[PDB]
Amino acid sequence: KVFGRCELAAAMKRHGLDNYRGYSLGNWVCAAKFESNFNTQATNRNTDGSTDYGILQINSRWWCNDGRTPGSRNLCNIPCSALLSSDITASVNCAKKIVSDGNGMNAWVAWRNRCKGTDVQAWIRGCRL
Ligand SMILES: [Cl-]
Ligand SMILES: [Cl-]
Ligand SMILES: [Cl-]
Ligand SMILES: [Cl-]
Ligand SMILES: [Cl-]
Ligand SMILES: [Cl-]
Ligand SMILES: [Cl-]
Ligand code: NA
């Protein structure tokens, strides 16, 4: 599924991400924009052989099982395929674990490089929320 901007803002808010760990909804929308372009089926293979999955490009090294990332963990206790669903519940629940891990949203390199410190409220401007 390719979400619209305001459509994803609303889904993220419905699933409790707005101000989760102190990060406003615009931070989450921005991260999703640059990680996936709002596409649930986004995948990206890393040089280390791990894969990133879904709207927030969650990595198989720690967070999900894909059976092809040697030495990895599955801390969200999900198949990485669950992160590609039209239903963002698994992505959101797993994102709450990641952002709790100690480094906040710096876990998402694209958030650090493209969202952090910017006017992220622009990402939810105009949306009925
Ligand atoms: Cl957009
Ligand atoms: Cl915001
Ligand atoms: Cl594996
Ligand atoms: Cl594990
Ligand atoms: Cl699995
Ligand atoms: Cl959803
Ligand atoms: Cl933080
Ligand atoms: Na894994």
XYZ file of N, CA, C and O and ligand atoms in Angstrom:
524
model
N 0.859 -1.216 0.000
C 0.000 0.000 0.000
C 0.878 1.243 0.000
O 1.797 1.327 0.852
N 0.574 2.218 -0.845
C 1.203 3.539 -0.804
C 0.224 4.469 -0.128
O -0.824 4.770 -0.720
N 0.560 4.906 1.071
C -0.288 5.832 1.858
C -0.125 7.215 1.288
O 0.952 7.601 0.839
N -1.203 7.982 1.426
C -1.079 9.434 1.358
C -0.478 9.986 2.644
O -0.508 9.342 3.676
N 0.031 11.195 2.576
C 0.685 11.850 3.726
C -0.272 11.947 4.920
O 0.069 11.512 6.053
N -1.425 12.570 4.722
C -2.387 12.774 5.837
C -3.012 11.434 6.247
O -3.294 11.209 7.414
N -3.230 10.552 5.285
C -3.728 9.191 5.563
C -2.768 8.447 6.501
O -3.200 7.842 7.439
N -1.452 8.542 6.281
C -0.500 7.857 7.167
C -0.435 8.563 8.510
O -0.356 7.848 9.521
N -0.429 9.895 8.530
C -0.450 10.647 9.797
C -1.604 10.113 10.635
O -1.427 9.810 11.814
N -2.782 9.946 10.038
C -3.978 9.519 10.794
C -3.811 8.098 11.304
O -4.132 7.789 12.442
N -3.233 7.195 10.525
C -3.065 5.787 10.910
C -2.055 5.711 12.048
O -2.197 4.940 12.997
N -0.982 6.476 11.917
C 0.054 6.500 12.984
C -0.534 7.024 14.289
O -0.215 6.467 15.318
N -1.397 8.023 14.200
C -2.022 8.598 15.417
C -2.979 7.563 16.001
O -2.968 7.384 17.242
N -3.733 6.863 15.156
C -4.722 5.879 15.628
C -3.965 4.795 16.387
O -4.472 4.379 17.383
N -2.718 4.459 15.992
C -1.908 3.379 16.605
C -0.969 3.903 17.699
O -0.105 3.129 18.172
N -1.121 5.133 18.134
C -0.474 5.631 19.356
C 0.930 6.146 19.128
O 1.665 6.283 20.121
N 1.332 6.448 17.891
C 2.715 6.951 17.670
C 2.860 8.444 17.956
O 3.985 8.941 18.131
N 1.782 9.201 17.870
C 1.874 10.663 18.050
C 2.352 10.996 19.464
O 1.715 10.631 20.450
N 3.513 11.633 19.537
C 4.235 12.006 20.772
C 4.759 10.776 21.521
O 5.169 10.922 22.687
N 4.872 9.617 20.856
C 5.439 8.416 21.496
C 6.928 8.675 21.776
O 7.660 9.077 20.880
N 7.373 8.461 23.003
C 8.777 8.736 23.426
C 9.099 10.205 23.140
O 10.274 10.540 23.033
N 8.078 11.069 23.121
C 8.268 12.518 22.957
C 8.428 12.947 21.520
O 8.765 14.114 21.265
N 8.210 12.050 20.566
C 8.387 12.408 19.149
C 7.023 12.717 18.530
O 6.149 11.829 18.393
N 6.865 13.959 18.096
C 5.591 14.415 17.496
C 5.302 13.650 16.218
O 6.228 13.135 15.537
N 4.037 13.644 15.836
C 3.591 12.879 14.667
C 4.382 13.281 13.420
O 4.650 12.448 12.570
N 4.681 14.549 13.228
C 5.450 15.037 12.061
C 6.804 14.358 11.939
O 7.270 14.117 10.814
N 7.456 14.070 13.065
C 8.728 13.287 13.049
C 8.530 11.908 12.411
O 9.378 11.477 11.609
N 7.460 11.232 12.753
C 7.170 9.882 12.249
C 6.805 9.924 10.786
O 7.242 9.041 10.059
N 6.009 10.924 10.415
C 5.609 11.086 8.988
C 6.852 11.378 8.134
O 7.055 10.784 7.088
N 7.673 12.305 8.585
C 8.928 12.638 7.895
C 9.788 11.385 7.756
O 10.338 11.169 6.664
N 9.959 10.616 8.819
C 10.851 9.444 8.737
C 10.276 8.482 7.699
O 11.010 7.923 6.870
N 8.966 8.288 7.735
C 8.332 7.369 6.763
C 8.488 7.871 5.341
O 8.752 7.056 4.415
N 8.374 9.174 5.141
C 8.560 9.755 3.800
C 9.932 9.343 3.256
O 10.017 8.860 2.090
N 10.993 9.584 4.022
C 12.347 9.380 3.461
C 12.786 7.929 3.546
O 13.692 7.535 2.741
N 12.216 7.156 4.439
C 12.557 5.709 4.502
C 11.895 4.952 3.354
O 12.584 4.110 2.714
N 10.611 5.209 3.053
C 9.821 4.318 2.165
C 9.045 5.072 1.086
O 8.365 4.398 0.305
N 8.999 6.403 1.148
C 8.050 7.181 0.317
C 6.617 6.720 0.596
O 5.791 6.706 -0.331
N 6.344 6.252 1.803
C 4.986 5.935 2.322
C 4.512 4.607 1.740
O 3.294 4.318 1.800
N 5.446 3.810 1.222
C 5.098 2.509 0.579
C 5.347 1.395 1.586
O 6.520 1.132 1.947
N 4.317 0.694 2.045
C 4.458 -0.449 2.976
C 5.330 -1.546 2.393
O 5.900 -2.268 3.202
N 5.401 -1.676 1.075
C 6.133 -2.825 0.489
C 7.589 -2.488 0.195
O 8.276 -3.332 -0.405
N 8.084 -1.358 0.618
C 9.497 -0.963 0.461
C 10.414 -2.000 1.124
O 10.214 -2.366 2.259
N 11.485 -2.353 0.421
C 12.588 -3.191 0.904
C 13.900 -2.624 0.414
O 13.971 -2.014 -0.636
N 14.940 -2.818 1.206
C 16.293 -2.340 0.875
C 17.286 -3.305 1.505
O 17.220 -3.529 2.674
N 18.172 -3.865 0.688
C 19.238 -4.795 1.114
C 20.456 -3.975 1.501
O 20.871 -3.121 0.680
N 21.013 -4.297 2.634
C 22.202 -3.591 3.170
C 23.434 -4.365 2.752
O 23.345 -5.562 2.482
N 24.587 -3.704 2.785
C 25.863 -4.342 2.366
C 26.192 -5.555 3.253
O 26.862 -6.467 2.729
N 25.734 -5.573 4.511
C 26.016 -6.619 5.530
C 25.094 -7.818 5.302
O 25.255 -8.807 6.037
N 24.162 -7.729 4.356
C 23.232 -8.824 4.035
C 21.936 -8.755 4.833
O 21.046 -9.603 4.550
N 21.769 -7.822 5.753
C 20.474 -7.554 6.423
C 19.578 -6.830 5.417
O 20.078 -6.355 4.396
N 18.281 -6.796 5.720
C 17.287 -6.158 4.842
C 16.454 -5.231 5.714
O 16.145 -5.602 6.836
N 16.092 -4.096 5.161
C 15.124 -3.171 5.808
C 13.737 -3.348 5.169
O 13.624 -3.423 3.887
N 12.690 -3.315 5.982
C 11.324 -3.657 5.522
C 10.329 -2.571 5.924
O 10.261 -2.194 7.086
N 9.488 -2.216 4.975
C 8.238 -1.515 5.288
C 8.379 0.006 5.323
O 9.419 0.582 4.954
N 7.295 0.625 5.802
C 7.178 2.110 5.818
C 8.289 2.779 6.618
O 8.610 3.909 6.279
N 8.789 2.159 7.673
C 9.871 2.703 8.500
C 11.147 1.880 8.339
O 12.117 2.060 9.090
N 11.220 1.054 7.299
C 12.491 0.407 6.883
C 13.214 -0.193 8.116
O 14.443 0.051 8.394
N 12.476 -1.070 8.792
C 12.950 -1.793 10.001
C 13.857 -2.940 9.593
O 13.527 -3.679 8.676
N 15.003 -3.031 10.270
C 16.142 -3.883 9.849
C 16.107 -5.269 10.506
O 15.751 -5.427 11.691
N 16.421 -6.288 9.713
C 16.402 -7.716 10.086
C 17.577 -8.054 11.004
O 17.522 -9.152 11.539
N 18.566 -7.184 11.178
C 19.751 -7.485 12.045
C 19.281 -7.638 13.480
O 19.785 -8.511 14.174
N 18.306 -6.841 13.919
C 17.828 -6.844 15.314
C 16.364 -7.186 15.451
O 15.986 -7.760 16.458
N 15.508 -6.740 14.538
C 14.101 -6.481 14.920
C 13.086 -7.486 14.379
O 11.993 -7.558 14.940
N 13.409 -8.184 13.287
C 12.470 -9.141 12.677
C 13.244 -10.321 12.107
O 14.433 -10.205 11.852
N 12.526 -11.425 11.902
C 13.133 -12.623 11.306
C 12.795 -12.729 9.814
O 11.615 -12.739 9.448
N 13.843 -12.830 9.005
C 13.675 -13.123 7.571
C 14.408 -14.426 7.164
O 14.333 -14.751 5.981
N 15.020 -15.136 8.093
C 15.721 -16.397 7.850
C 16.987 -16.254 7.047
O 17.550 -17.293 6.701
N 17.434 -15.058 6.676
C 18.613 -14.901 5.777
C 19.532 -13.802 6.323
O 20.239 -13.158 5.502
N 19.520 -13.562 7.629
C 20.427 -12.588 8.244
C 21.211 -13.292 9.360
O 20.849 -13.222 10.538
N 22.320 -13.986 9.016
C 23.072 -14.724 10.036
C 23.442 -13.915 11.268
O 23.952 -12.813 11.184
N 23.185 -14.518 12.423
C 23.601 -13.994 13.726
C 22.621 -12.975 14.229
O 22.794 -12.456 15.336
N 21.539 -12.769 13.504
C 20.565 -11.708 13.835
C 19.619 -12.096 14.958
O 19.480 -13.284 15.326
N 18.931 -11.079 15.475
C 17.855 -11.240 16.451
C 16.510 -10.919 15.806
O 16.446 -10.458 14.636
N 15.464 -11.146 16.544
C 14.077 -10.884 16.131
C 13.363 -10.298 17.355
O 12.481 -10.916 17.944
N 13.758 -9.087 17.730
C 13.329 -8.517 19.029
C 11.861 -8.087 18.976
O 11.217 -7.983 20.026
N 11.283 -7.871 17.784
C 9.852 -7.542 17.648
C 9.015 -8.823 17.584
O 7.785 -8.711 17.551
N 9.692 -9.978 17.522
C 9.009 -11.308 17.493
C 8.008 -11.405 16.341
O 6.830 -11.785 16.518
N 8.461 -11.043 15.136
C 7.618 -11.040 13.917
C 8.470 -11.496 12.741
O 9.702 -11.258 12.671
N 7.822 -12.133 11.750
C 8.458 -12.272 10.442
C 8.585 -10.893 9.814
O 7.676 -10.036 9.932
N 9.703 -10.635 9.173
C 9.904 -9.300 8.532
C 8.798 -9.041 7.492
O 8.406 -7.898 7.263
N 8.231 -10.064 6.872
C 7.083 -9.893 5.949
C 5.905 -9.140 6.593
O 5.123 -8.476 5.874
N 5.684 -9.285 7.891
C 4.576 -8.575 8.580
C 4.749 -7.064 8.432
O 3.749 -6.304 8.537
N 5.985 -6.603 8.262
C 6.274 -5.172 8.106
C 5.914 -4.672 6.721
O 6.064 -3.429 6.518
N 5.457 -5.519 5.797
C 5.117 -5.069 4.431
C 3.591 -4.963 4.233
O 3.159 -4.587 3.119
N 2.816 -5.304 5.261
C 1.333 -5.330 5.227
C 0.733 -3.944 4.939
O 1.339 -2.906 5.335
N -0.433 -3.911 4.304
C -1.217 -2.664 4.203
C -1.582 -2.171 5.608
O -1.821 -0.976 5.769
N -1.686 -3.064 6.577
C -2.045 -2.743 7.971
C -0.741 -2.418 8.705
O 0.130 -3.267 8.716
N -0.582 -1.183 9.177
C 0.735 -0.747 9.749
C 0.900 -1.165 11.208
O 1.916 -0.800 11.753
N 0.012 -1.950 11.803
C 0.099 -2.331 13.237
C 1.492 -2.914 13.546
O 2.130 -2.459 14.519
N 1.983 -3.874 12.772
C 3.255 -4.528 13.119
C 4.387 -3.512 13.011
O 5.269 -3.462 13.914
N 4.431 -2.684 11.980
C 5.468 -1.620 11.841
C 5.430 -0.681 13.037
O 6.494 -0.339 13.547
N 4.247 -0.242 13.418
C 4.135 0.709 14.553
C 4.587 0.038 15.851
O 5.368 0.628 16.592
N 4.090 -1.161 16.149
C 4.454 -1.810 17.421
C 5.967 -1.992 17.472
O 6.569 -1.891 18.544
N 6.559 -2.409 16.360
C 8.025 -2.645 16.318
C 8.776 -1.311 16.455
O 9.781 -1.227 17.227
N 8.353 -0.257 15.762
C 8.913 1.112 15.890
C 8.882 1.590 17.346
O 9.832 2.207 17.784
N 7.846 1.276 18.093
C 7.798 1.719 19.511
C 8.945 1.068 20.274
O 9.583 1.733 21.115
N 9.220 -0.218 20.007
C 10.377 -0.912 20.640
C 11.686 -0.255 20.220
O 12.567 0.000 21.093
N 11.854 0.030 18.935
C 13.138 0.578 18.419
C 13.382 1.934 19.085
O 14.459 2.205 19.502
N 12.374 2.792 19.087
C 12.595 4.189 19.568
C 12.799 4.201 21.082
O 13.261 5.255 21.604
N 12.428 3.139 21.777
C 12.652 2.936 23.228
C 14.069 2.420 23.523
O 14.413 2.312 24.729
N 14.882 2.074 22.520
C 16.120 1.256 22.696
C 17.257 2.086 23.286
O 18.247 1.486 23.735
N 17.121 3.404 23.315
C 18.142 4.274 23.946
C 18.542 5.489 23.113
O 18.835 6.547 23.693
N 18.479 5.413 21.787
C 18.979 6.491 20.895
C 17.773 7.172 20.244
O 17.973 8.034 19.338
N 16.579 6.912 20.746
C 15.415 7.592 20.180
C 15.343 7.377 18.670
O 15.668 6.315 18.162
N 14.988 8.425 17.950
C 14.728 8.263 16.509
C 16.036 8.333 15.720
O 16.018 8.034 14.519
N 17.159 8.492 16.378
C 18.479 8.400 15.698
C 18.692 6.993 15.139
O 19.575 6.833 14.252
N 17.924 6.006 15.615
C 17.989 4.631 15.064
C 17.745 4.680 13.572
O 18.288 3.846 12.829
N 16.911 5.600 13.128
C 16.582 5.802 11.698
C 17.561 6.819 11.151
O 17.375 8.022 11.363
N 18.609 6.350 10.469
C 19.639 7.271 9.924
C 18.968 8.330 9.045
O 19.400 9.502 9.163
N 17.980 8.013 8.228
C 17.280 8.989 7.354
C 16.595 10.052 8.219
O 16.508 11.218 7.796
N 16.015 9.668 9.356
C 15.431 10.684 10.287
C 16.529 11.638 10.773
O 16.319 12.866 10.740
N 17.648 11.101 11.238
C 18.746 11.937 11.748
C 19.205 12.909 10.653
O 19.390 14.087 10.891
N 19.371 12.387 9.448
C 19.977 13.195 8.359
C 18.963 14.110 7.681
O 19.411 15.074 7.034
N 17.659 13.835 7.676
C 16.705 14.615 6.826
C 15.566 15.203 7.626
O 14.883 16.091 7.069
N 15.307 14.734 8.837
C 14.126 15.182 9.603
C 14.544 15.954 10.844
O 13.922 16.974 11.188
N 15.485 15.406 11.575
C 15.939 15.957 12.856
C 16.223 17.450 12.710
O 16.994 17.841 11.848
N 15.571 18.223 13.572
C 15.830 19.668 13.676
C 15.114 20.491 12.629
O 15.231 21.708 12.665
N 14.393 19.862 11.707
C 13.662 20.557 10.634
C 12.257 20.872 11.127
O 11.795 20.380 12.162
N 11.510 21.615 10.313
C 10.129 21.972 10.651
C 9.221 20.789 10.350
O 8.454 20.828 9.378
N 9.297 19.766 11.184
C 8.592 18.483 10.900
C 7.067 18.670 10.990
O 6.332 17.822 10.433
N 6.554 19.707 11.656
C 5.088 19.924 11.731
C 4.524 20.134 10.320
O 3.357 19.841 10.071
N 5.311 20.576 9.369
C 4.877 20.735 7.964
C 4.327 19.407 7.424
O 3.411 19.407 6.595
N 4.828 18.273 7.920
C 4.402 16.938 7.427
C 2.958 16.599 7.812
O 2.378 15.778 7.155
N 2.370 17.279 8.806
C 0.961 16.999 9.222
C 0.095 18.235 8.985
O -1.119 18.147 9.272
N 0.656 19.283 8.391
C -0.070 20.562 8.156
C -1.239 20.298 7.211
O -1.079 19.624 6.193
N -2.420 20.784 7.580
C -3.608 20.629 6.724
C -4.378 19.344 7.002
O -5.541 19.245 6.624
N -3.788 18.378 7.674
C -4.423 17.060 7.849
C -5.539 17.127 8.913
O -5.300 17.668 9.983
N -6.667 16.475 8.658
C -7.738 16.324 9.675
C -7.285 15.233 10.632
O -7.203 14.093 10.164
N -6.901 15.558 11.861
C -6.322 14.559 12.794
C -7.060 14.619 14.126
O -7.711 15.657 14.383
Cl 4.299 13.857 0.428
Cl 4.718 17.526 14.314
Cl 18.064 -15.034 10.123
Cl 15.508 -12.647 19.323
Cl 9.296 -15.711 11.543
Cl -3.253 0.703 9.100
Cl 14.802 10.810 22.773
Na 16.581 -11.138 12.288
